[PDB]
């Protein structure tokens, strides 16, 4: 209900800290291009259903907008605008030549079918075809979207434009112009941020104790990366509980027994709950799981020197304040989870060139980009006695404000 207001508040605070006037905030608080469309879709039963779609473009001064499309019944204009602004912030943090964009459709994919989903995706692409393209707006997947939906959208756009346009949409399969590293991008970015934070704090990664809350794809890849780097993972968690071993957890065996959903717990063995998993003795803590897990009660009980928010908003304002008081280095999600956006940008670059890179090239480029962003944010937060979250917000808004001023919009 207040997501847009909160985003506006953080934008205002960042602009005030940077010293920009109020006209910049007036321009950047709301997107300058919001489109609402009605999509008629023929269903399997033969009836026709009218779906509602939204597409918001926060800014285009830096470059073409970059956004995602989510198929949820609770989507709203306010949510779409707020997430477009957040995407702009992420792009500015990573220093991409992108703006912020966000798409949404009011639907229930659980009740929808394969052919109905294809028809809905095509209809949405048609409705927004007038303001999107490889040079205007680049969509990607979000909740209840995947490579098949991206491929359907790409086919729709090519069928409209009379020529193939792989760069119009990212998140595609490899055969259609996808990029390697699309699955381990977030985990690799989190690993890079963890390594940089450890270097800054003097903690040696070799033998460092890491706890990961969440063993999905991101959690599994992150645990594998720490194990390869030499850090010891002393705790993992899944939907059924967690495990604890100060001397190591045998990540190889855990991954071998890992199923599709990421379950690794045994049946007749007691498990460790997340509440006391977060309180374990470790140097690095990584919540990549459900949000609102760190609060006042557990902030003092947390024993981690570094906390990295792999998931979205796993920490509250009070928890951040307490961690800052306790001198615990917090890595915000807006920075940690930018690996997916970076890999989508690499996919766009590959589509533009016609040349597709390899896993090693993607790895090294992502490493350099994330390291530069992390170092810039850390230097900003050291020069100004503020938090990394505020520093990241300022870094995100600076590029957009400067581009708008240079182009003369304000």
């Amino acid at each position: 209900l207040d997501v847009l207001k909160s985003t506006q508040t953080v934008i205002h605070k960042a602009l005030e800290k940077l010293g920009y006037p109020e006209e910049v905030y007036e321009l950047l608080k709301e997107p300058m291009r919001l489109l609402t469309v009605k999509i008629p879709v023929r269903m399997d039963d033969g009836s026709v259903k009218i779906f509602t779609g939204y597409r918001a473009q926060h800014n285009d001064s830096v470059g073409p907008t970059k956004g995602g499309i989510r198929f949820h019944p609770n989507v709203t204009e306010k949510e779409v605008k707020a997430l477009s602004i957040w995407m702009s912030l992420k792009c500015g943090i990573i220093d991409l030549p992108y703006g912020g964009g966000k798409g949404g459709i009011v639907c229930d994919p659980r009740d929808m079918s394969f052919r109905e989903l294809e028809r809905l995706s095509r209809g949405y692409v048609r409705a927004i075809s007038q303001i999107v393209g490889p040079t205007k707006d680049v969509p990607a997947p979000d909740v209840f979207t995947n490579s098949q939906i991206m491929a359907w959208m790409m086919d729709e756009y090519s069928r409209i434009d009379e020529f193939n346009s792989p760069g119009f949409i990212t998140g595609k399969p490899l055969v259609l112009g996808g990029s390697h590293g699309r699955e381990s991008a977030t985990a690799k970015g989190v690993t890079i941020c963890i390594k940089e934070a450890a270097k800054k704090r003097g903690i040696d990664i070799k033998g460092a104790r890491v706890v990961v809350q969440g063993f999905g794809n991101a959690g599994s890849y992150l645990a594998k990366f720490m194990h390869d780097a030499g850090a010891k993972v002393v705790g993992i968690s899944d939907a059924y509980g967690g495990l604890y071993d100060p001397e190591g957890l045998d990540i190889d065996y855990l991954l071998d027994r890992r199923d599709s959903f990421g379950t690794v717990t045994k049946l007749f063995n007691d498990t460790i709950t997340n509440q006391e998993l977060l309180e374990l003795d470790c140097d690095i803590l990584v919540p990549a799981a459900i949000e609102n897990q760190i609060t006042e009660e557990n902030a003092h009980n947390i024993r981690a020197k570094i906390v990295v928010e792999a998931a979205n908003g796993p920490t509250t304002l009070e928890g951040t304040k307490i961690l800052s008081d306790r001198d615990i280095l917090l890595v915000p999600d807006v920075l940690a989870s930018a690996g997916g956006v970076t890999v989508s940008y690499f996919e766009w670059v590959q589509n533009n060139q016609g040349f597709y890179w390899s896993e090693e090239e993607v790895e090294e480029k992502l490493e350099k980009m994330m390291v530069k962003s992390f170092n810039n944010i850390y230097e900003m937060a050291n020069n100004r006695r503020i938090d990394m979250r505020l520093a990241a917000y300022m870094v995100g808004v600076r590029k957009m404000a400067e581009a708008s001023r240079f182009r003369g919009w304000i």
Binding site: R110, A239, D259, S260
Partner: protein
């Protein structure tokens, strides 16, 4: 068929103790076929056991011998297997949570396609079963690899088919027609809240089950103050 006794003596104790609740003084009530009251089709089926010619085993003590691994998808060429035979989903537990069920439904992957069949009837149970068969065959021809038999979207006019009967009939039909190995069966029924129910469904063909109504009952109990443990842990 839920009851206050059923809830307070099977669902809450399961959460509290991590095991099926114990009892004493074995059944003195009549069989389902003899009871005047209407009974579920589950109560007409009795679990068998190993008496002689084969012994039982202790799963807890010999967990290294057991396996709950389940495969979802279409089997590859058994005689000449290569890669594609393992291009499927695997689960550690046949019981599916709501989020897992939604993810499976929304996979969308062309190689891994899903189709939902509403196992409901009004007057002709044979007709309902035959429409379910035709829908399954059509989905298989289209390339679907998951069949989701749902009792949802039921009202006074449409009553849900007994899930055990539906699963068994579909399993037998696909086995006869040589198509069972190309698909897997997910059940989304409210008449699934007991170990006997889950075991019967699995043994008669169900690959996975989703007790949405039991989850909803747990959520209601949590919301109304009782069962302080959270919904996810429950």
């Amino acid at each position: 068929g839920y009851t206050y006794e059923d809830i307070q003596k099977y669902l809450i104790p399961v959460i509290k103790e991590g095991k099926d609740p114990l009892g004493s003084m074995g059944n003195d009530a009549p069989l389902a076929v003899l009871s005047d009251r209407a009974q579920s089709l589950f109560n007409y089926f009795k679990q068998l056991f190993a008496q002689v010619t084969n012994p039982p085993i202790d799963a807890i003590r010999e967990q290294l011998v057991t396996s709950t691994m389940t495969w979802l998808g279409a089997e590859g060429d058994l005689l000449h297997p290569s890669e594609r035979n393992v291009r499927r989903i695997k689960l550690y537990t046949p019981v599916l949570s709501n989020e897992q069920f939604y993810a499976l439904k929304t996979i969308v992957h062309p190689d891994l396609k899903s189709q939902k069949i509403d196992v409901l009837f009004s007057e002709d149970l044979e007709r309902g079963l035959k429409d379910m068969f035709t829908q399954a065959e059509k989905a298989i021809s289209q390339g679907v690899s998951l069949l989701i038999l749902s009792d949802k979207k039921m009202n006074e006019r449409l009553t849900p088919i007994p899930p055990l009967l539906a699963v068994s009939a579909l399993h037998q039909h696909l086995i006869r027609k040589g198509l069972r190995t190309k698909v897997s069966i997910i059940v989304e029924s409210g008449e699934a809240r007991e170990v006997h129910h889950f075991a019967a469904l699995i043994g008669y063909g169900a690959d996975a089950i989703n007790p949405y109504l039991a989850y909803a009952t747990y959520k209601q109990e949590i919301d109304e103050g009782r069962l302080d443990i959270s919904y996810e842990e429950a």
